[PDB]
């Protein structure tokens, strides 16, 4: 009870103080054969986190307990070592345990996860880590346990969280949590759908008034905060939720047009308005793949796509390189999606939606690569390199399927590989003689 609480308090200290385990997931996995009983005392944990002391817990150790708690909850639910330690056939008794564990952590965390979110509402890192939990719930128990009350509680708290936060980690964690609760059962489906589309509506109104405030305006620092703040939330959700019924593309399109014309739109507002527009378009495509869509259906989406390909192209010329990257990424996505590939799986109705990038665009997709993939000059650089890598791999796809001139490409890859082709073999010797 407090005998387990001491063992957990010390286990959190051995993790932080000793870089003998870097990764929580890996620590827990290693101790799992040997200390399963302790690592699934979930009441003991939620207690430590929620209770006031009689030695108090410091911000950093709390964070660590929460991260270890989630890792235990996974390993119990999945009943297999995490990604990186995997090698998968359970015995009668292993399976029987998995079922009993899942029941325990669900019954428990349904009750307690709302209270954890409550208490730690402003700690983005903590909230995002906590919201990884419902994915492991036996969601049917929101009916079985007559536990309707606690589902309202969770939803009340996910509201507070979205209303308080703008970090893309938190928001995404909030979007995924809805997707999980929202479609997993029918019993609960209806309830969640309502909470969601209320949450949305509130943020579309704010966004829309915020858009108007800004474009009508001299433009206040607040005018800029309000537009961005709301957009971010809607962009986050628009990935896994189909918000097409609210014409978001419309207002994003204006934001982007104003930033090109008068050239004075904040860089984060542009990037978000780009991403949000893209998500608008993919969900427009999905409805039009699955329906039996008419002529005008197609042609109205086409104009939307060309008017947007235009915006992304123009946005390559934005001063702020983050814009350029977003611009580029969406161009290299969209040009691939709205290729002739779109007439695979018998879907040759979609011919009018196909796009071939003109010369001027192809040349600017060659530009960016020389200017922003292949550049002259800690952990911010290994993360920066993997991105230019993705920007290039996304550009690679366009070259292979002849959507940009495959020879103009090759000549840039020639130019920058020059020293590998000129002096590489003489480097080869070196790393076999030293
Ligand atoms: C670091 C590196 O990256 C690519 C090539 C090399 C390289 O040549 N390293 C080296 C040269 C001479 N002695 C020892 C090592």
- DSSP assignment of 218-251 equals ---HHHHHHHHHHHHHHHHHHTTS--TTS-HHHH
Nearest to 249 by CA among 223, 275, 225: 275
How far apart are the C-alpha atoms of 72 and 108, rounded to whole Å? 14
Map tokens 């989406």 to a residue.
301
Torsion of CA 201, 203, 205, 208, to 10 degrees: -130
How far apart are the C-alpha atoms of 73 and 24, rounded to whole Å? 12
Q: Is 264 exposed, middle or buried (0-12, 13-18, 19+ CB in 10 A)?
A: exposed
- Cα dist from 338 to 15, 79, 85, 281, 282, whole Å: 49, 42, 39, 11, 11
Mutate to test the pocket of ligand 1, among 430, 432, 433, 434 (most ligand atoms within 8 A of CB): 430
Nearest to 68 by CA among 37, 27, 116, 33: 27
Torsion of CA 147, 153, 129, 122, to 10 degrees: -170
**190 touches ligand 1 (CB under 6 Å):** no
Q: Are 171 and 162 within 8 A, CB to CB?
A: yes
Sign for the CA dihedral angle at 161, 241, 234, 320 comes to positive
- Write the CB contacts of 278 (distance below 8 Å, at least 6 apart in sequence): 308, 330, 333, 334
162 CA to centre of ligand 1 in angstroms = 49
355 CA to centre of ligand 1 in angstroms = 45
420 CA to centre of ligand 1 in angstroms = 13
How far apart are the C-alpha atoms of 421 and 382, rounded to whole Å? 25
**427 touches ligand 1 (CB under 6 Å):** yes
How far apart are the C-alpha atoms of 206 and 348, rounded to whole Å? 41
How far apart are the C-alpha atoms of 65 and 14, rounded to whole Å? 12
- Write the CB contacts of 256 (distance below 8 Å, at least 6 apart in sequence): 265, 270, 273, 274, 277, 311, 315
384 CA to centre of ligand 1 in angstroms = 23
**377 touches ligand 1 (CB under 6 Å):** no
Q: Are 233 and 203 within 8 A, CB to CB?
A: yes
How far apart are the C-alpha atoms of 406 and 317, rounded to whole Å? 23
- Cα dist from 294 to 245, 299, 300, whole Å: 19, 9, 10
How far apart are the C-alpha atoms of 271 and 319, rounded to whole Å? 12
Q: Which atom in ligand 1 lies closest to the alpha carbon of residue 427? A: 8
* Structure-token pair, residue 111: 């009750």
* Structure-token pair, residue 255: 């934001």
Q: Are 117 and 127 within 8 A, CB to CB?
A: yes
**420 touches ligand 1 (CB under 6 Å):** no
First to last CA, the chain: 60
- Cα dist from 210 to 39, 219, 227, 311, 376, whole Å: 48, 12, 5, 21, 41
How far apart are the C-alpha atoms of 182 and 306, rounded to whole Å? 34
How far apart are the C-alpha atoms of 3 and 20, rounded to whole Å? 25
Three-state DSSP class for residue 303: helix
DSSP code at position 352: G
Q: Which long-range contacts (CB under 8 A, 24 or more apart) does 209-217 make?
A: 211/251, 211/254, 211/255, 214/255, 215/254, 215/255, 215/258
- Write the CB contacts of 244 (distance below 8 Å, at least 6 apart in sequence): 280, 283, 284, 287
Residue 398 CB neighbours (<10 A): 20
Q: Are 416 and 374 within 8 A, CB to CB?
A: yes
- Write the CB contacts of 205 (distance below 8 Å, at least 6 apart in sequence): none
How far apart are the C-alpha atoms of 332 and 322, rounded to whole Å? 15
Experimental determination approach used? X-ray
427 CA to centre of ligand 1 in angstroms = 7
How far apart are the C-alpha atoms of 392 and 174, rounded to whole Å? 31
**434 touches ligand 1 (CB under 6 Å):** yes
385 CA to centre of ligand 1 in angstroms = 19
Q: Are 293 and 326 within 8 A, CB to CB?
A: no
431 CA to centre of ligand 1 in angstroms = 7
Specify the residue with its C-alpha closest to ligand 1, atom 4: 427
Diameter over CA atoms, the chain: 74
Distance from chain centroid for Cα 393: 20
417 CA to centre of ligand 1 in angstroms = 16
**432 touches ligand 1 (CB under 6 Å):** no
Phi, psi of 325 (to 5 degrees): -60, -50
Specify the residue with its C-alpha closest to ligand 1, atom 8: 427
Mutual angle of helices 148-164 and 186-216, in 10-degree steps: 20
**430 touches ligand 1 (CB under 6 Å):** yes
Q: Are 394 and 386 within 8 A, CB to CB?
A: no
How far apart are the C-alpha atoms of 156 and 175, rounded to whole Å? 14
Phi, psi of 347 (to 5 degrees): -95, 45
- Write the CB contacts of 314 (distance below 8 Å, at least 6 apart in sequence): 260
How far apart are the C-alpha atoms of 247 and 72, rounded to whole Å? 42
Q: Which long-range contacts (CB under 8 A, 24 or more apart) does 318-326 make?
A: 318/259, 318/267, 318/270, 320/267, 320/270, 321/372, 322/267, 322/268, 322/271, 323/267, 323/270, 323/271, 323/274, 324/368, 324/372, 325/372, 325/387, 325/391, 326/270, 326/271, 326/274, 326/275
């Amino acid at each position: 009870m407090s005998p387990n609480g001491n063992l957990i308090r010390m286990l959190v200290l051995f993790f932080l103080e000793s870089e003998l385990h870097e990764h929580a997931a890996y620590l827990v996995d290693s101790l799992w054969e040997s200390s399963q009983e302790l690592l699934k005392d979930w009441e003991c944990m939620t207690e430590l986190l929620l209770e006031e002391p009689v030695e108090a817990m410091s911000d950093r150790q709390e964070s660590a307990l929460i991260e270890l708690m989630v890792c235990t909850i996974r390993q119990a639910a999945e009943a297999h070592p995490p990604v990186g330690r995997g090698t998968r056939v359970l015995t009668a008794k292993e399976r029987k345990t998995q079922i009993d564990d899942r029941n325990k952590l669900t019954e428990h965390f349904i009750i307690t996860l709302p209270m954890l979110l409550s208490k730690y509402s402003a700690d983005a890192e903590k909230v995002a880590n906590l919201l990884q939990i419902p994915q492991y719930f036996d969601l049917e128990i929101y009916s079985t346990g007559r536990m309707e009350k606690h589902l309202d509680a969770l939803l009340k708290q996910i509201k507070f969280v979205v209303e308080k936060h703008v970090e893309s980690d938190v928001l995404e964690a909030c979007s995924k949590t809805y997707s999980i609760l929202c479609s997993e059962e029918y019993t609960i489906q209806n309830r969640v759908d309502i909470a969601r589309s209320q949450l949305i509506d509130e943020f579309v109104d704010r966004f829309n008034h915020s858009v108007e405030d800004l474009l009508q305006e001299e433009a206040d620092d607040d005018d800029i905060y309000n537009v961005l703040s709301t957009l971010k939330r809607l962009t986050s959700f628009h990935n896994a939720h189909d918000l097409t019924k609210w014409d978001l593309f419309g207002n994003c399109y204006r934001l982007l047009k104003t930033g090109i014309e008068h050239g004075a739109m904040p860089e984060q507002i542009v990037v978000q308005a780009l991403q949000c527009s893209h998500y608008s378009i993919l969900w427009q495509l999905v409805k039009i793949t699955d329906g039996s869509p008419s002529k005008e259906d197609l042609l109205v989406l086409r104009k939307t796509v060309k008017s947007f390909l235009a915006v992304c192209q123009q946005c390559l010329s934005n001063v702020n390189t983050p814009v350029k990257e977003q611009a580029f990424m969406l161009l290299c996505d969209l040009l691939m999606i709205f290729s002739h590939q779109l007439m695979t799986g018998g879907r040759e109705g979609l011919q009018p939606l196909v796009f071939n990038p003109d010369t001027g665009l192809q040349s600017e997709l060659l530009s960016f690569v020389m200017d922003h993939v292949f550049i002259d000059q800690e952990a911010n650089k290994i993360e920066a390199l993997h991105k230019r890598r993705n920007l290039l791999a996304a550009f690679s796809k366009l070259i292979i399927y002849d959507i940009v001139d495959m020879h103009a490409a090759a000549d840039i890859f020639k130019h920058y590989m020059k020293y590998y082709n000129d002096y590489g073999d003489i480097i080869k010797e070196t790393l076999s003689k030293t």
